[PDB]
């Protein structure tokens, strides 16, 4: 019954976790566009790479 409970909840846990990494990667790519254009510096892009990690 413990194994069945964990099988029941880890699917939505990992779904909500993979959506988090997708949103953090989108934030990283938007910050990289801001860095490539020339608005932000190389200190702000590294603060988004760490959130990805």
């Amino acid at each position: 019954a413990d194994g069945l409970a964990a099988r029941g909840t880890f699917t939505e846990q990992l779904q909500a976790q993979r959506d988090l990494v997708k949103a953090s990667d989108e934030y990283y790519q938007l910050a990289d566009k801001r860095y490539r254009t020339g608005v932000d510096n190389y200190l702000t892009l590294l603060d988004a790479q760490r959130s990805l990690f």
Partner: protein, 52 residues
């Protein structure tokens, strides 16, 4: 430092350089340079008069 920060820094640099150039011409107006060359006449004012 991002490119926009430097492009805003050197703009304020050039604006202050233009302000110093604006101060230098008012400082050059206090030494009344002769506008042309020629024969100068009698001075209509002497030392001590107030001009405008």
């Amino acid at each position: 430092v991002s490119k926009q920060q430097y492009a805003d820094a050197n703009a304020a640099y050039l604006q202050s350089k233009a302000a110093v150039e604006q101060a230098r011409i008012n400082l050059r107006y206090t030494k009344v340079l002769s506008p042309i060359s020629g024969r100068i006449g009698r001075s209509a004012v002497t030392e001590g008069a107030l001009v405008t």
